[PDB]
Each structure stands twice: as structure tokens, then as C-alpha cells.
Amino acid sequence: AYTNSFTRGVYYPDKVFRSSVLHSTQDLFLPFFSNVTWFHAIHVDNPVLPFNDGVYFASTEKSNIIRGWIFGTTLDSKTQSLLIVNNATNVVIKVCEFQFCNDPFLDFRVYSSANNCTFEYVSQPFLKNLREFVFKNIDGYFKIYSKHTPIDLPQGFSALEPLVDLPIGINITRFQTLLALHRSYLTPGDSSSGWTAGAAAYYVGYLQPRTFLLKYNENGTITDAVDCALDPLSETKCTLKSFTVEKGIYQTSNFRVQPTESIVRFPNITNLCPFDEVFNATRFASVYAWNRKRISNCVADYSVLYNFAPFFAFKCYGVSPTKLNDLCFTNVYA
Amino acid sequence: ASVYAWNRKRISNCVADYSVLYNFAPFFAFKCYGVSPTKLNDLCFTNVYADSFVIRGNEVSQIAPGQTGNIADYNYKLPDDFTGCVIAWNSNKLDSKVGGNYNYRYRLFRKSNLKPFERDISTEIYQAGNKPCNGVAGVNCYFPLQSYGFRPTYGVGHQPYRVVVLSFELLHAPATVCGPKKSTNLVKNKCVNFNFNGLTGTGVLTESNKKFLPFQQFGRDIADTTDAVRDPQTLEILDITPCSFGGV
Amino acid sequence: DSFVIRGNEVSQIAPGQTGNIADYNYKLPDDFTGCVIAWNSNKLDSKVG
Amino acid sequence: FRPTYGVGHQPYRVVVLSFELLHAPATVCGPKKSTNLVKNKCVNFNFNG
Amino acid sequence: QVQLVESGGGLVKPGGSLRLSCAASGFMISDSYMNWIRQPPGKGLEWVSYISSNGYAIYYGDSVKGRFTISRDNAKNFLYLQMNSLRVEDTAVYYCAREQPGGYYDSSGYRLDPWGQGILVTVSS
Amino acid sequence: SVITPGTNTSNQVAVLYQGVNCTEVNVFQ
Amino acid sequence: SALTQPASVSGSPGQSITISCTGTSSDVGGYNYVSWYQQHPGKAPKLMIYDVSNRPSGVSNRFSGSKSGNTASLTISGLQAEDEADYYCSSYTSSSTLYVFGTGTKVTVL
């Protein structure tokens, strides 16, 4: 499905305090008014969603039906998937390359294969309640921002705070969510029946590189923001660095048609060098009077050599053959 | 470890002193980009890493900001904005046997170069203009890894060289590791030279009245003037104002 | 001026250049002018033991 | 010092030359000579450097 | 705790061949450098061969050079030593031993701690 | 260039591309 | 290249013993990687000391290794009963062949 994300997703990007000032920063934000994919948490339980570049994950629930995540590049134990599991008591973060089942287990507390853990961390838990989360993983780090607010995505503006920054370096490409249910059985595999749960739904949104003009109020909190690259009026506000533009004409930026293709034009490769003249020789010289011939001032190509000779031995010292077709030399000997 | 599988270890949350390193290893080369070692004993850092491996002796130079060769194309590469230090000391007395130490290898063939600070350990046979040989070697289809075969008679530039690299940021993020330097009792309301966790400046310190959020460490006015800072010992927030001046 | 030093420190003998040889051992001014000469001598100053 | 260490640990005999060039009263310089003085003519001169 | 049990030795005739199996228990033989120690009757101990953890460095005893191949079954998690083309002077007991500093930041010299139980071999008419 | 009648009057906006004709960019020449 | 280890020794409870273990200037002298093992009849030889001053687990402090130039020397204190066993000094080398061994010592207590 689809639903536009309103003016949401702004977060404190550099954790340095600033008061009553406007600042322009270039970072991965959620473009305003963009539509976001929507999935529901009843049963089939949840399909896989890619982690393209960053997820803006919001969930509205009041019975703890949504309880965790699992991330990683593959379900096999061949790579260090990630675990984030909430609980009434704490969060459990793990990086252990544990092979998973065909479906994420529904919390009868665990269903997964063995682990070869490399990093572990624990801290307080992530717990009408509007949960918003922003996950980004670019710089060797996985970062969490969050906010819980009383109350579709509301039009009210509210910024996210950096909660935890995980230095774990897993190559993350897909991500899934973890569900739960009361007095529910748990097995590695189940049909689309699922189990009953409270009414809830969760939205997913994607970050992009954008330039934002952030307004900090006198208390050091972000209160409004304008997307510098959305439409002409926002681009004009962002260039004057001012939220109110008076009547007039303004030169904001420049446009330039991009090149649609690349072409190279060189002379028709012509005066070749005599190679099929040294390997195809009919009669050789003896070792103690080996023959040397200087070959220069010509275009030599070492791509034709694979034809001739099953090549019991073909090796080079100081160069690699795949790169040999490229360099230019002084005088090559044979 | 070998170059093609360099090993990384994070060192943090401790008092680091870079005066003891002069001991170990004659240190043929010990140089830093972005800091100078005699002053290195003072600053506080974000997160310092240590990578260790063994490479040939004509390639030490390849471990530099943005230098091309064959040890920094597909083996291991550092970024172009690197900051930190590199260290090498010829070790030809413990890693080179008679007959070739076939224990350390490096990727000679790679499809595409690698981004900074990533290591690839997958063993795969190079291609040859056709569906790659599935287990064999023809004109091409070579084994990806080639042994060094270190021997105790080579020229120094071919003897192996143990190397270790330290790399750390200095944006003054929450200090996790500092040099030895001891603390001093705090003075307020007087023009005093201060050195807060590496940030050096002058001005009068006053109890602050602005609300730092708990995850913040520095405060700024317009034009990067450090306007406020939180104490690294007692966490009270402090305001900075330059002492009085004017024209005569 | 004459004295004897190690073989990894030649770079250290410069005005106010850091290593461990030009800060507190013996130091030249920051406006130095002249030349420096060093030669590894292991055949007349190093004995067995 | 021992005669088998790595290059960075062997000694270096060293000597440092230091001299001013404010062209103060010349005390040393031979590789040339002198020439008869010329007056009233555009001439390139080399006075002790 | 950690045992190294052997199997495959016994009596043999000169000229033939044989295979020794070193079974590791208490730890993983797939990442611990190994090397065999043989002891003739009434003498000291002697180095046989050496496998690395990598699997790419193999060092044999100088007398058994040319023969006495070594390998590891990371599937069956054992060590195998096949003695090939034996001679009469090779009668001895054999031990399968593991090098202690198999970690990556040890700063401690090598030392053979876990030894193999050991089996004897007799090659004659 | 962006033509704007003022933030406090209304958000409508008209755009002027200076050195090009829209045949190769309502429309007006 | 083999280490030369003496035949046997003898003393009574309460005494202390020493044993010399020489070598060349490539195995013992120049690397200080030498070790010492013990063997009761019918068991794989067990490590007594290595890294000369580095005494490993369980070992009674009564053993004290030392290395001077090329020679190495062990010193055992407090004659007990278990001493009935062979002792071998081993070392890590640098050419082909990575370990050599000593002739073996017999330590018997009266």
C-alpha cells in the first residue's frame, strides 16, 4: 500500500548544542511528503522488507504486539546477522551470525540455529503511544533515534533524539520485524493463521541524502524544518536562509542538462607487432646461443596469445597479464 | 595475521600513553599524518583502532593516504582523509624460514578495487575470458592467493615487515581515551587558561544557565566559537566568555 | 658539533621536529641554518657483547 | 649496540655545521679570486657573495 | 579435559605404507597448529612434521622428507598422518601434539602442552 | 529564477528559466 | 644440531638439584624460546618449564630454569617422590626443523 509521510523524520544530527539559530546541514533525512510502504501485524507473520539505505520505522500500538527486530544480509549462518530484542526489562543486542528459520520466530521464547557471536551489548528496554524510530547504517555504525509521543501519521512536528550508536560493522541489506502474541504456541514453521492480537499497524519509511534548514528554538529544540530541495518555494527559503520571503524575484540556482552518453574515438588500430612471428617460429636456436630480437615502435597486443599453445607455462614477473595490455613501455625484448 | 586477513582490535576506555612505544621494535618508520607524536601524549580521542599484519619490504610505502600500488588496491587500503600513525619495524628474524615461509599470502587478482578499510577473504579462482575454470588453472584462472615464501637471504626490500596502524578521530566526541595529564581544581569567575578534555582556550568560566541535553558534550555560538562546555569530572555545565578588552 | 645517535632518528635532527631526539635531548633553534651529516658507523664503535 | 640489529637500532656518528649568512665580515671563502675594480660603468659585481 | 587419542599404528613390514589417525577431543583441531613427535626406543623425542592452522604451511622432519604425508579431516575433525614407504630404522613410538599459543594476542613463546596418547610402530620381517 | 508574491500573501509561485526555450527545457515565451 | 643433556642425578629428600642443557648459537642462544618436559614411564612427556622463567600451571615452584648465553640450566628444589621421571629440554629454531631435543635426564631420589 501507500501513504504520504508528512513533515516527520527530523533528528538531531551532531549532538552539539545550539540555541536560537538557523543551520543548514547535508545528511540522510526523510524527504517530506513522501509515501511510505505500510504493512500489518495480524498474520502473514511479516514479509521481508529491504534495508535500502535507512529506515524510518514508526509503529502505533498499545499492547506490545511489536517486540523486536532481526537484521542482516542473509538468513544463513554465513554472515553476522543482528538481533535487537525488547522486553519488559531490557534490550538485547547481539551480532552472532545465527542461521534463522524460514520465518522469524514469534515470541516458546526462541527458535533459531547456532551462533558464533562476536559482540554483545545490553541496556534498558525500548519501552496512544506513538513510537517513531530512525535507523541508519552508513559509516560503520548503526544508529538509533527515538521518540514516544501521545496522540495516521500526525501532522504535528516533533524531532527524534540519538539514543544509541552501535559501532558493529555488519553489511546490512535486509531487515525484518519480530512479533509476539499472548498464550501463543511457537514453532519453526506456521501457516497464515497466526494468533489474535490487539489492533495495531506499523509504517516504514526510507531516508535519502537531503539538505535541511533546521530551526532551533531558544531551548535548543528543533521546531521546524524546510526541505531545501523539494519545490521552488522551499528552495528559495533555503537560499535566503530565512523562513519568510517577501515579494520579489530571486535567482536561486542553476540547471544543466546532463550528458547522456560517453564516446571515445581513436585511430583504427593498424601497424601491429610481430608476435605470431616469434611463437610460430618453425626452427629455434639453441639454449647456449639463444636468440634475442628487439621489438619496438609498433602496437603490441597480448590478447591473441591464448589461441596458440595449450600453454603449459605462462607467467610474468613484476606485472600481471590482465593489466599488461595497458601500460606503455620503452623497448620490449624477446 | 596476514595482509589479506588483517586483524582489527578496538582499544578504548583506558588511559593511553604513547611514550612506551619507543621500547618495542627498532621502529624503522614511525610517522603520523594529522598529529605530531611528541604532542600525541596530550589529546583525548574518540575511538582508537589497531590493525596488525605482515607485508613485504618494498610495499611499506603503499600504506599511506591515497597511494597506488598492489598492496593498497585489493589487499588493504586506508582512506584519503586518514589521520593517525603508521608503524613498521623490520622483522626478518621470526617470520622467515629457510625454503620460503609459505604462511602469508595476498590477493593478486581482483575484479574491482575496494573501499577504505574493508577486508575480503573469499577464495575464488580468477576468470579467463570464458566461464571461469571450476577448480583448475589455464592461461589465466590462477589461484587468487600467492604465497610470499619469505627466506632469510633476500634483500631487505623483500624481507617481510610487521606493521601496525593506529587510526582515530579528533572531532572532540565524548572522550574515551586520553593521555596521562592530571586534573586540577576548578576556578570560576576569573580570566584563566583552561584545557577541557583537549579543547584549549582562554576566558572566564561561569556557572551556565542553558539546558544541555544529556547526550551533548559541547556548545556553540555563531561562527564555531566554543560557547559552553560540560565538565568531564562533575558534569556541571559551564559558560565561556573572553575576558574584557577594547581600544585605547 | 659531534656526538653519536641511533639509525631511525636521522629525521629527528631538525629544528623543533618531533620524535624523541629533538625536544629534550639536544635541540637546535627553530631558525637553524646550515647542514647536518650522519653516517651509520658499526665497524669502529660497536664491540661484541 | 650489538652488530646484528635492525637498521633502526644501529648507531650513527654525526657532525653538524652551523654558520650565519647575514654576509657579516667574511672569514672563509676561496674557490675563485679577485678582479680589478671598475668605476663609472654598468657592471655586475660580486662582493664576497 | 583435552585428550589426543591415536589409532592406526602397530606392526608392519619394510617397504609397505601406513596411515596414522590423531583424534582430538576437548577442543577444535580445525584451528590449532599441530606437529607430531616420534620417539625411538630408548632415546629422546624427535620432531616429525608440522601443520599450521592456515593449512598452507607444512613442515616435515628432515629424515622423513619425501614421505610421511600429513593432512586434516575438518569434516571428521581428526588429524591423519600416513607413513609411506617405511624402512627398518623407522621403528619408534609416535606422538600427536598441539601448540599452545593458538590465539591471536598471546605475547608468549610457543610450548607444546596437550600431548597425544601415542602409538608405537614396528617395521621388520 | 523564482517569482513569488510573498510568503504572507500566498504560496503560489512561477518560475523563470533564463537562457533556454522550453521546447528543450502554463507556458509562455 | 641437538641439545646435549646429561645422564642422571641423585639426591635425598630436602636437597636441590641442577641440570645443564647446552645448544648452539641458533636454537637456545639467540631466541630464548627453550622449554623442559617430564616423563613418567608410560605417559606422554609432560611440560615442566618453557620460556625459562615462565613456569606453567600446576608446576611446583621447586623448578627454576635459567638461560645464560648458550647454556641453559634447570634447578629443582625440595626432593619429593614423583621425581622418578625423564626430563627433556626442547627449543624452537630458525632454519629447517622447528624443534630439537635433548638427550634426556633421569632424576632419581634415594
CATH of the domain at A39: 2.60.120.960
**Nearest-angstrom CA–CA distance, A176 and E119:** 55
The DSSP annotation for A105-118 comes to --------------
Sequence letter at residue E78: F
Q: Is A300 left (phi over 0), alpha (psi -120 to 50) or beta?
A: beta
Question: Domain holding E97: CATH number?
Answer: 2.60.40.10
Touch between A and B (at least 3 CB pairs under 8 Å): yes
- List the end-to-end C-alpha distance of chain E, in Å, as a whole number: 40
Q: Which chains touch G (3 or more CB pairs under 8 A)?
A: B, E
Which of these, B63, B87, B88, lies nearest to B77 by C-alpha position?
A: B63
Q: Which residues of F touch A231 (CB under 8 A)?
A: 13
In chain G, where the domains are located:
8-109
Torsion of CA B170, B174, B177, B180, to 10 degrees: 90
Which one-letter DSSP state was computed for residue B2?
Answer: B
CA distance B156 to chain D (A): 10
CATH classification (class only), G8-109: mainly beta
Name the residue type at position A77.
Answer: S
Identity of the residue numbered A196: T
- Answer yes or no: is A19 within a domain: yes
- Minimal Cβ distance to A247: which of F6, F16, F17: F6
CA distance linking residue G50 with residue G56, whole number of Å = 8
On whether residue A306 sits in a domain, the answer given is no
Q: Is A310 exposed, middle or buried (0-12, 13-18, 19+ CB in 10 A)?
A: exposed
Contact between chains at E56 and B9 (C-beta distance less than 8 A):
no
Residue E105 and residue B102: Cβ atoms within 8 Å?
A: no
Output phi, psi for B4, to 5 deg.
Answer: -70, -5
- Tell me which residue of A174, A43, A45 sits closest to A103, measured CA to CA: A45
Q: Which three cell numbers stand for residue B130?
A: 570464458
Secondary structure of residue E29 in the 3-state scheme: helix
Q: How far apart are CA C21 and CA E125, in angstroms?
A: 73
Cα–Cα distance, E48 to E60 (Å, whole number): 6
Neighbours of chain D (3+ CB pairs under 8 A): B, C
Q: Name residue A204's beta-bridge partners.
A: A57
Report yes or no on A64 lying in a domain.
Answer: yes
In chain B, residues with a C-beta closer than 8 Å to the C-beta of G96 are: 97-99
Name the residue facing G97 among E62, E113, E117 (closest C-beta): E62
With beta carbons less than 8 A apart as the criterion, state whether A82 and A118 touch.
no
Q: Are the C-beta atoms of A325 and A273 separated by less than 8 Å?
A: no
Cα(B107)–Cα(B142) distance, integer angstroms? 11
Residue of A nearest to F6 (CA): A247
Residues 23-52 (E) with a CB less than 8 A from some CB of B:
52
Instruction: Count the neighbouring beta carbons within 10 Å of the beta carbon of residue A170.
Output: 20
User: Are G105 and G86 contacting, i.e. CB atoms less than 8 angstroms apart?
Assistant: yes
Please tell me what resolution, in angstroms, this structure has.
Answer: 3.7
Instruction: Look at chain E and report how many structural domains it folds into.
Output: 1
The reply to whether A320 touches chain B by the CB within 8 Å rule is yes
Q: How far is B24 from chain D (nearest CA, A)?
A: 11
Q: What is the DSSP letter of A121?
A: E
> Is A244 touching B (CB cutoff 8 A)?
no
SS3 E68: coil
Residue A300 near residue A275 (C-beta atoms within 8 A): yes
Give whole-number Cα distances, A61 to A41, A128, C35, in Å. Answer: 10, 7, 77
Q: End-to-end distance of chain A based on CA atoms, in angstroms?
A: 69
The residue among B92, B94, B96, B150 with the most chain G CBs within 10 A of its CB, best to mutate, is B94
Domain range holding E31?
Answer: 3-123
Is residue A75 within 8 A of residue A99, CB to CB? The reply is: yes
Chain B residues in contact with C20 (beta carbon < 8 A): 22, 38
Phi/psi at D2 (5° precision): -130, 150
> A65: number of CA atoms within 13 Å, CB side?
21
Beta-carbon contacts of B68 under 8 Å, excluding residues fewer than 6 positions away, are: none
For residue A210 the three cell numbers come to 537531503
Residues of chain B whose C-beta is under 8 A from some C-beta in C? 22, 26-30, 36-39
Contact A278, A261 (CB under 8 A): no
G22 and G38 in contact (C-beta within 8 Å)?
no
Distance CA E73, CA A287 (A): 47
DSSP, residue by residue, B98-163: TT-BTT-EEE---SS---TT-------PPP-SSS--SS--SSS---SEEE--B-TTS-GGGS-EEE
DSSP E26: S
**Residues of chain C positioned with their CB less than 8 A from the CB of D1:** 42, 45-46
Q: Which residues have C-beta within 8 Å of that of residue C40, sequence separation ≥ 6?
A: C7, D7, D10, D11, D12
**Alpha carbon distance B44, B172 (integer Å):** 7
Residue A234, phi then psi, degrees to nearest 5? -65, -35
Picking from G67, G97, G100, G106 by the largest number of E CB atoms within 10 A of its own CB, the best residue to mutate is: G97
Contact status, residue B86 vs residue B77, Cβ threshold 8 Å = no
Report which secondary-structure segment, H or E, holds B226: strand B226-230
**Domain-embedded: residue A25:** yes
From residue A245, how far is each of A236, D15, F3, F17 by CA, in Å?
8, 72, 11, 20
Cβ of A246 within 8 Å of Cβ of F6? The answer is yes
CB contact under 8 A, G35 and E35: no
Inter-chain CB proximity C48 and D3 less than 8 Å: yes
Nine-digit cell string for A266: 581513436
Interchain contact, C42 vs D1, CB within 8 Å: yes
A172: in domain: yes
Residue closest to B148 by CA, chosen among B140, B157, B139? B157
Closest C-alpha among A139, A118, A97 to residue B117: A139
3-state secondary structure of D36: coil
What subunits make at least 3 CB pairs under 8 angstroms with E?
B, G
Dihedral, CA atoms, E52, E58, E61, E67, nearest 10 degrees? 130
Alpha-carbon separation of residue G26 from B25, D1, G96 (angstroms): 20, 20, 12
Q: By the CB < 8 Å criterion, does E66 face chain B? A: no
Nearest to B215 among A162, A305, A322 (CB): A162
Long-range contacts for A198-201 (Cβ within 8 Å, ≥24 apart)? Answer: A198/A61, A198/A62, A198/A63, A198/A65, A200/A41, A200/A59, A200/A60, A200/A61, A200/A62, A200/A63, A200/A65, A200/A66, A201/A38, A201/A39, A201/A40, A201/A41, A201/A59, A201/A60, A201/A61
Backbone angles phi, psi at E56, to 5 degrees: -115, 5
G99 grid coordinates: 624443534
- Helix/strand/coil for F23: helix
Among candidates D2, D14, D16 on the partner chain, residue whose Cβ is nearest the Cβ of C46 = D2
Chain F, residues 1-29, CB within 8 A of chain A, namely: 1-9, 11, 13, 15-17
Expressed as residue numbers, the domain containing A133 is 2-256
Say yes or no: E88 contacts chain B, CB-CB below 8 A: no
Where are any strands of DSSP class E within E26-125? 34-39, 46-51, 58-60, 69-73, 78-84, 92-98, 119-123
Distances (CA, A) of A98 to A82, A114, A116, A275, G61: 9, 5, 7, 56, 45
Chains E and C touch (3+ CB pairs under 8 A): no
